Paper text:
In order to elucidate the molecular details of the interaction between [name] and [name], the complex structure of [name] and the unphosphorylated Hpt domain of [name] (residues 1–135) has been solved to 1.40 Å using Seleno single-wavelength anomalous dispersion (SAD) for phasing. CheA3P1 forms a four-helix bundle (αA–αD) with an additional C-terminal helix (αE). The site of phosphorylation, His51 in CheA3P1, is located on αB, in close proximity to the active site of the RR with the phosphoacceptor Asp56 on [name] being 7.5Å from His51 on CheA3P1. The buried surface area of the interface is small (530 Å2), indicative of a weak interaction, consistent with the transient nature of the complexes.
Two-component pathways comprise sensor histidine kinases (HPK) and response regulators (RRs). Once phosphorylated, the HPK transfers the phosphoryl group to an aspartate residue within the receiver domain of the cognate RR. Neither [name] nor CheA4 is capable of autophosphorylation; instead, CheA4 phosphorylates [name] on H51 of the P1 (Hpt) domain. Once phosphorylated, [name]-P serves as a specific phosphodonor for the chemotaxis RRs, CheY1, [name], and CheB2.
Numbering used by the authors:
A (entry chain A): 8 to 136
B (entry chain B): 0 to 112, 119 to 134
């Protein structure tokens, strides 16, 4: 089990690095066309990794991020400044969850990220009314 | 014959390790190759003609001329089982698997909510067919 936990931390860091890079590029004024795919793939990878290890609370945060990014990719919602903002907050939150869970070899307590969940659910509802 | 030689093809390193670790516990299958992309899969397969069973991510993009899947289907006698990230029931994955020439499809295992019971059963059914 040492090896899979090591890989969770390493692969997770690469995925979150890619998530953050795409979001920072968008914040700097690069076009969504170049970044929504990489962003989706990074979040999807992070989600799948957490699912492998049964980390359902971590998984649920990544899943809601993926839903929001999917609305942009598939349902014609623009990648507006608010989406970018919420996902940057999500990337920081996921990074803290990664560092903690990798070390506890267990799922996180959801309390600290309930605010993020509310923000994601709110943006999802508002831009897909 | 015994054990059956398995190749795992999935771009997710966590899924390759998880499935490989599980196959270590089956006396009737061993892993002989793992690959993260189509060209690597071709490289390992073309060099390792004793492969009996290929487990292939249904989410992995096909090569532009589908050289890996074509080689596997047309130049080897390996059985091919697609791996799906969602429940197969209610998905398009069972139909997509048949269309691609795969011999079966099964949901990827997880440490979530036994562990590879369905996977082992499917692998065995395929080799006994
Ligand atoms: Na654009």
């Amino acid at each position: 089990m040492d090896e899979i936990w090591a890989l969770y931390a390493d692969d997770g860091a690469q995925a979150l690095d890619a998530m953050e890079a795409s979001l920072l590029a968008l914040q700097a004024g690069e076009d969504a066309a170049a970044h929504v795919g990489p962003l989706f793939r990074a979040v999807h990878t992070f989600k799948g990794n957490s699912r492998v290890l049964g980390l359902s609370v971590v998984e649920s945060r990544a899943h809601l991020c993926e839903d929001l990014i999917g609305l942009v990719r598939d349902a014609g919602v623009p990648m507006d400044g608010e989406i970018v903002e919420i996902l940057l907050f999500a990337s920081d939150t996921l990074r803290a969850m990664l560092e903690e869970t990798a070390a506890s070899r267990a799922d996180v307590e959801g309390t600290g990220s309930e605010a993020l969940m509310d923000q994601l659910r709110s943006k999802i509802a508002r831009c897909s009314r | 014959g015994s054990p059956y030689n398995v190749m795992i093809v999935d771009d997710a390193a966590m899924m390759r390790l998880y499935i490989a670790s599980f196959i270590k516990t089956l006396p009737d299958f061993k892993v002989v190759a793992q690959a993260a992309n189509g060209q690597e899969a071709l490289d390992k397969l073309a060099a390792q003609p004793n492969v009996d069973l290929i487990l292939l991510d249904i989410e992995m993009p096909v090569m532009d001329g589908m050289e890996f899947l074509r080689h596997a289907k047309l130049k080897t006698r390996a059985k091919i089982c697609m791996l799906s990230s969602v429940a197969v029931s209610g998905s398009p994955h069972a139909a997509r698997a048949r269309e691609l020439g795969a011999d079966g499809v099964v949901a990827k295992p997880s440490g979530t909510v036994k562990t590879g019971g369905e996977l082992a059963r499917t692998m065995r059914t395929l080799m006994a067919a």
